[PDB]
Design a protein around this ligand. Structure first.
Ligand SMILES: Nc1ncnc2c1ncn2[C@@H]1O[C@H](COP(=O)(O)OP(=O)(O)O)[C@@H](O)[C@H]1O
Ligand SMILES: Nc1ncnc2c1ncn2[C@@H]1O[C@H](COP(=O)(O)OP(=O)(O)O)[C@@H](O)[C@H]1O
Ligand SMILES: Nc1ncnc2c1ncn2[C@@H]1O[C@H](COP(=O)(O)OP(=O)(O)O)[C@@H](O)[C@H]1O
Ligand SMILES: [Zn+2]
Ligand SMILES: [Zn+2]
Lengths: 474, 716, 279
């Protein structure tokens, strides 16, 4: 297209692209030159300088900085080319139609459409840098689920992305709420039919988009109780053990492949979904520390063409066998030894998954800053699908929870009770409220300057009917 | 019909064209109609048609901005077609030119564009320019982007985005791509070859389907550095309108290991995906040098990848690959077979007309003074390639600046406009620049053209007729040779005393058949023998084949023909196709020293003696060398010619040169004493007093004995 | 299908796994045919390449070839212009043993090639493909195809006068009026330039004992020397005497020794190889 592709993407990408991120440096004591004129040590440091990152204890390079590096590496202006897209998502599937004179793969292949050997290697750029939980309650309730039932859990985490000043051109995913799909949790694992999950999540995500959220990851708990007097949990995931066994890696790769990130610098228009997965395991001590991870782009394009399956060894992923419709070339994984030489080891029977991951830094908002949480809620109306526990959404709980506040007034108190994510979802599910009335409800419950909108809402006949039936109902 | 004449429009509107009533009737146009107008360089625009009977029938009027956008001048022809399917511009993003907007405060949009587009419905296309005249200011803009693309009508409701950083004006000019054929001169033959080899496959592919053939794909241009190969490729690509994908050699070879292959693959894939396209691989010799060069694996993988890509494109895709190399032998031999760069083109130094064209092309922005004699400079510049001429112009301008530097205050950073006006290059500046020129094209063998007729060679009528019947007849009447089943003779060998003018005969023979001439002097042959030269005999004959019909000339062949070099020469001579109009002419002074193998049939068999000039020939030579010199009125050179019996042409040149030296000495002495615009007979007598024959009697007798032996060898 | 440069263009350590998988797949889906095009690039002469990779690839190829020799119905075919360029170790028993030589075609071969290529072109009635075949000597098939392409290009160039390049489309009558004339083929012959003869090649000759004069005793001697061993080896075996190997002609230059050699070759119907003095 005679230049860079034309498409509209997230605002974070645009604003990051506008910046250049150069880190200025002052006159070094080793310079030999007048005030003006910078020689080699006084020049600005590019944002992708690996030395700075590894010197500041940052293990990855804030993907946008990687994009800047790639653009600088080539694509001279005014001449030298007609623009070559610098980013391309690797694809391993055999070209079903090459036809230099041969027939399709099932009964014929040439050397031009043969998937070349794949060299697994740890990725160097992580798309999303910092995953941030707005409030401790959001995950405290989730862990309380396990406390009460004892079984594991699993839930998507909606939220939005923004800049992250602490890292060069870094991004942070702020999670606002957690929604628990219908799943059959158990002592050692959890199970859930994919069809129901996707069907439900389609409408749930539509409603969330209407509210201004977005599905930005999945969080599951892998916790076991220790023998100490208090509540302590073993640390089964450390350097020696497996950080993430095969199956969770596979599921994360599938999820990433199904949540592509739209980008302006690829032929297809997408690259390396901004999807973050969080796991709760417990730190070296008995705490309930959390963690974050993200499977690299090669693993993203590796699971799509099958080629991987779980192995009885937790820390290693099995490799499948060649067959029609699935061609699996030799997989070499590259590591580094203590002598500073890269070694390629063939691992067909099984290979560790440490080369298919990048780790993110979890955290919580500073407790001495402005509060921009969408929802001051999540300690109230029980969450959606806690049928296994006693929690159950229904008229009676609404009557017990959100009746006395509305029946009198005190709108300041009411607002916080109306800004609860699951409450909004439930009332929308009832379908009592009219579409536009619900739209103004969400605009009042997820936005400031809400006095007039809240008054209008309580004016609309829909809310009158809601409160009347709620009071009448036991 | 639609070839409307261009004329300057009275109105200042940027999207209004006035047409004649008669033409409007012919094309069924009407007032207010939006029409697509195409001019030159495939440039197109959208103009609102207005009837205007003032113009002559078949003429249209457009303003300055539209003509600038169309890259056309007044008096040209433009084609106007209906544009009824133009939609309203949903959103137009436009940015101004920085220099124009300097000194403007407030919102530029409201000041200029808001009245300009409201109730205007001006069609706008990407890459166009419109100028707004507001108050006491005039500001130009650009149609940066239009939605829907690529053009649309800016309605009242159309949204306009003026936000954005200023656009520097220097980019448009200093990046003057889209150069047409008018920017290339002196190489019409090669330009025509490339056009007939590229345009037809791309512009009219249906031709080859009708004839049912696979058009040639690869093309390989080569010649001395600085002869405009890249310029020709750029011009052809721009005129053809194809998806040009320039690739550099050093740029690709500067990438990390394992990246150059990826760049090549991506480039070829994109070129294929957007057919038609034209890939230009500049300096291919830097990617795939000769095998004996670097043997590193990184230097082999790139070559293998390039070969695989070249072989893999054979399909219904319209992809043409053009490569440029200094010499044909630098590239790996594997890149010169079928399905690859099998078509070759040779670029040679231009002739006088070519140099004149180059000077005019470059010397159109200079503030030249009146005393300019471009023809004189073209005559006095021999062996200059285009780059050398550009450097000459730059140096002349620098010399003019130096001369005018006296009226400039270096410390002050501002210069009076009056001084700037006085700047102007002069003929003396160009002569000084020539004095400082450093040509380097001639350091190696290069194809060139000569313009010597049967008038600079005096006498020797029998030799002239022999050469004519040997060379000219085959070229002009090959059908007769086919009818009689006779294979034309390849080459001849001139032998005789030095200075007889063998080179002149070779140049004349080349000129008569209109054939390019290649020269190989003795020092070049010696350098090839020692292997320290940049070219080899095989390369010379490859260039001769490429630039056919050519005439290869070897000088003082006896130095090497006293052998590896002679073996290579014999192999090449036997290899060349007989039908090819390539003639190898050898010159030597000691024919018996030549290796007998050279004289065998099917090779330089014909042996032609070149005698010394006779009295009439000497007189003609003297007159020819003195045509452009001021002589004494009433002076006769017949006596001098008579007195110079037995002297060679070089001797006569020496006599004339000494006479001129004495004349200049006397003139300089007179001027210093201060007259003699010409040369008096006394100077000629003084010069003749020092005459000395360059040929001894014994050598002439030996040449005569050899000639008699040769005649006897053919006399029965 | 495996190409030489295509495999050679891969990163280090990946030009061998491709060969491994190729041979493994060929074994899996037998019967299979493997065409290692341009085998020289992946197995040049031992002295040409000293790099480690250039020997790893060759060793891998040799190991796969040796391991392939088994009941599996898999056949390996390789092509290379220079027979000696291949690593000598590749020409032993259990490897590329059987060798086939491709020589430049003769007049009949040239006629067949020209007919095969000149079946779609709008040839004019005044075409004498037999004459072109007779005149073209030393033209390999690629040269003949290039000749036809150049002739068609010349025809379209001549017709360009009535063709308006500015218009994207052309009048249908002009497009349908294209016709290749004999003069176009002659011009293409003039332009073309074969290169096969630059190196030694195998070709056939059709000189009989009539284009030469005299030398009757010499002709009889040559017949006794060459023809009888070829035509009637049975009697030579009966007498147990092996035939003579070579012969040496000497005499004044220009007597026609080359024609005698060609006639001898024709009589035994044997291909003729030549080595001129410059060679
Ligand atoms: N008609 C012409 N022929 C040759 N050179 C020309 C001509 N017109 C302009 N030039 C100038 O000569 C030079 C040609 O550069 P060129 O040799 O094509 O570059 P490259 O080294 O990439 O081949 C440029 O400076 C160009 O401006
Ligand atoms: N008709 C002629 N016969 C001989 N020499 C001539 C004739 N016309 C001009 N010349 C001069 O003869 C010179 C030949 O120079 P040179 O090449 O050194 O000797 P030659 O040409 O005999 O090899 C040229 O400089 C040219 O000026
Ligand atoms: N019987 C013959 N005697 C002598 N020359 C002949 C005879 N027949 C043909 N020729 C001619 O001899 C030439 C080749 O001569 P030949 O002796 O074969 O090569 P060379 O001359 O190199 O020894 C051909 O051009 C051919 O026309
Ligand atoms: Zn410094
Ligand atoms: Zn294929």
């Amino acid at each position: 297209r005679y230049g860079p592709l034309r498409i509209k993407e997230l605002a974070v990408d645009e604003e990051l692209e506008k910046e250049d991120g150069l880190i200025p440096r002052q006159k070094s004591k080793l310079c030999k030159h007048g005030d003006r004129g910078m020689c080699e040590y006084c020049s600005p440091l590019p944002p992708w300088d690996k030395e700075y990152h590894e010197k500041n204890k940052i293990k990855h390079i804030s993907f946008h900085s990687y994009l800047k590096k790639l653009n600088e590496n080539a694509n001279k202006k005014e001449n030298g080319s007609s623009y070559i897209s610098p980013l391309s998502e690797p694809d391993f599937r055999i070209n079903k139609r090459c036809h230099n004179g041969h027939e399709p793969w099932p009964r014929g292949i040439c050397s031009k459409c043969q998937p070349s050997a794949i060299t697994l290697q740890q990725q160097e750029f992580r798309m999303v840098d910092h995953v941030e939980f707005q409030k401790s309650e959001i995950i405290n309730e989730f862990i309380q689920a396990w406390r009460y039932t004892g079984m594991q859990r699993f839930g998507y985490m909606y939220g939005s992305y923004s800049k992250y000043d602490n890292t060069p051109l870094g991004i942070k995913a702020v999670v606002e709420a957690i929604y628990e799909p219908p799943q059959h949790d158990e002592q050692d694992g959890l199970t859930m039919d994919v069809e129901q999950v996707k069907n439900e999540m389609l409408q749930i995500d539509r409603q969330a988009q209407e509210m201004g959220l977005s599905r930005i990851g999945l969080i599951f708990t892998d916790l076991s109780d220790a023998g100490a007097g208090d509540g302590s949990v073993f640390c089964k995931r450390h350097k020696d053990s497996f950080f993430l066994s095969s199956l969770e890696v596979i599921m994360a790769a599938r999820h990433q492949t199904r949540h592509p990130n739209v980008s302006k610098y690829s032929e297809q228009g997408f690259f390396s979904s901004k999807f973050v997965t969080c796991v709760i395991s417990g730190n070296l001590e008995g705490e309930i520390d959390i963690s974050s991870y993200q499977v690299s782009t090669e693993a993203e394009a590796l699971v799509t063409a099958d080629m991987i399956s779980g192995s009885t060894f937790p820390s290693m992923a099995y490799i499948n066998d060649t067959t029609d419709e699935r061609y699996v070339p030799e997989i070499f994984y590259m590591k580094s030894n203590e002598y500073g030489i890269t070694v390629k080891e063939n691992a067909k029977p099984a290979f560790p998954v440490d080369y298919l991951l990048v780790t993110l830094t979890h955290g919580f908002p500073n407790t001495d800053t402005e509060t921009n949480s969408k929802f001051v809620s999540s300690t109230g109306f029980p969450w959606s699908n806690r049928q296994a526990m006693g929690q159950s959404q229904d008229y009676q709980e609404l009557k017990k929870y959100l009746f006395n506040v509305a029946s009198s007034g005190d709108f300041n108190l009411l607002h916080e009770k109306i800004s609860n994510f699951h409450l909004l979802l439930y009332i929308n599910s009832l379908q009592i409220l009219s579409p536009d009335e619900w739209k103004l409800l969400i605009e009042s419950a997820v936005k400031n300057e809400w006095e007039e909108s809240l008054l209008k809402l309580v004016s609309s006949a829909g809310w009158q009917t809601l409160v009347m039936i709620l009071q009448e109902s036991g | 019909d639609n070839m409307l004449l261009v004329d300057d429009a009275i109105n200042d509107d940027n999207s209004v064209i006035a047409i004649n009533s008669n033409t409007m009737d012919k094309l069924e146009l009407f007032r207010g109609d939006t029409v697509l107008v195409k001019g030159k360089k495939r440039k197109d625009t959208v103009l609102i048609v207005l009837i205007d009977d003032e113009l002559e029938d078949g003429a249209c009027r457009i303003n300055r901005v539209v003509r600038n956008n169309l890259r056309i001048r007044l008096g040209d022809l433009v084609t106007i077609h209906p544009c009824p399917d133009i939609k309203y511009a949903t959103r137009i993003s436009v940015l101004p030119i920085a220099d124009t907007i300097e000194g403007i405060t407030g919102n530029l949009f409201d000041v200029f564009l808001k009245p300009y587009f409201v109730e205007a419905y001006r069609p706008v296309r990407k890459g166009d320019h419109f100028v707004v005249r507001g108050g006491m200011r005039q500001v130009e803009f650009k149609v940066v982007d239009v939605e829907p693309e690529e053009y649309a009508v800016v309605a009242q409701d159309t949204i306009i985005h003026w936000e954005g950083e200023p656009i520097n004006r220097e980019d448009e000019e200093n990046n003057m791509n889209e150069v047409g054929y008018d920017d290339i001169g002196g190489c019409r033959k090669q330009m025509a070859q490339i056009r007939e080899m590229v345009e037809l496959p791309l512009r009219h592919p249906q031709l080859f389907k009708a004839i049912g053939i696979k058009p040639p794909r690869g093309v390989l241009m080569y010649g001395p550095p600085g002869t405009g190969k890249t310029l020709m490729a750029r011009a052809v690509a721009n005129e053809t309108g194809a998806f040009f994908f320039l690739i550099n050699g050093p740029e690709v070879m500067s990438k990390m290991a394992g990246e150059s292959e990826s760049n090549l693959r991506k480039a070829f894939e994109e070129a294929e995906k957007n057919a038609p396209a034209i890939i230009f691989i500049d300096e291919i010799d830097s990617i795939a040098p000769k095998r004996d060069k670097t043997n590193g694996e990184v230097e082999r993988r790139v070559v293998s990848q390039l070969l695989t890509l070249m072989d893999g494109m054979k399909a219904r895709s319209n992809v043409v690959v053009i490569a440029a190399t200094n010499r044909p032998n630098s590239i790996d031999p594997a890149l010169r077979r079928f399905g690859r760069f099998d078509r070759e083109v040779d670029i040679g130094i231009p002739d006088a007309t070519g140099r004149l064209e180059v000077l005019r092309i470059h010397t159109k922005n200079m503030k030249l003074a009146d005393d300019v004699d471009l023809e004189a400079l073209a005559a006095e510049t021999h062996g200059y390639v285009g780059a050398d001429i550009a450097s000459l112009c730059s140096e002349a301008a620098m010399q003019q600046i130096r001369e005018k530097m006296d009226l400039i205050d270096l410390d002050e950073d501002e210069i009076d406009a009056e001084v700037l006006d006085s700047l102007g290059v002069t003929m003396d500046n160009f002569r000084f620049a020539l004095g400082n020129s450093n040509p380097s094209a001639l350091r190696e063998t290069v194809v060139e053209s000569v313009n010597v007729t049967w008038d600079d060679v005096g006498g020797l009528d029998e030799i002239k007729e022999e050469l004519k019947e040997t060379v000219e007849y085959p070229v002009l009447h090959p059908d007769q040779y086919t009818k009689f089943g006779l294979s034309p003779s390849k080459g001849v060998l001139f032998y005789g005393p030095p200075g007889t003018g063998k080179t002149l005969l070779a140049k004349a023979v080349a000129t008569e058949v209109s054939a390019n001439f290649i020269s190989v002097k003795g020092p070049e042959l010696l350098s090839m023998w020692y292997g320290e030269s940049e070219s080899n005999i095989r390369d010379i004959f490859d260039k001769a084949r490429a630039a056919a019909p050519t005439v290869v000339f070897l000088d003082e062949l006896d130095s090497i023909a006293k052998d590896r070099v002679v073996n290579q020469l014999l192999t090449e001579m036997d290899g060349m196709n007989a039908k090819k109009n390539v003639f190898v002419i050898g010159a030597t002074n000691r024919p018996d020293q030549i290796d007998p193998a050279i004289l065998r049939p099917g090779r330089l068999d014909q042996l032609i003696y070149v005698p010394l000039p006779d009295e009439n020939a000497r007189l003609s030579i003297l007159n020819a060398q003195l045509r452009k010199t001021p002589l004494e009125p009433g002076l006769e050179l017949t006596a001098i010619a008579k007195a110079t019996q037995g002297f060679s042409g070089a001797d006569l040149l020496y006599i004339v040169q000494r006479a001129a030296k004495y004349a200049i000495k006397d003139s300089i002495e007179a001027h210093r004493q201060h007259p003699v615009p010409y040369i008096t007979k006394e100077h000629f007598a003084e010069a003749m007093k020092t005459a000395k024959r360059s040929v001894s009697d014994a050598e002439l007798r030996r040449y005569e004995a050899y000639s008699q032996q040769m005649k006897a060898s053919r006399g029965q």
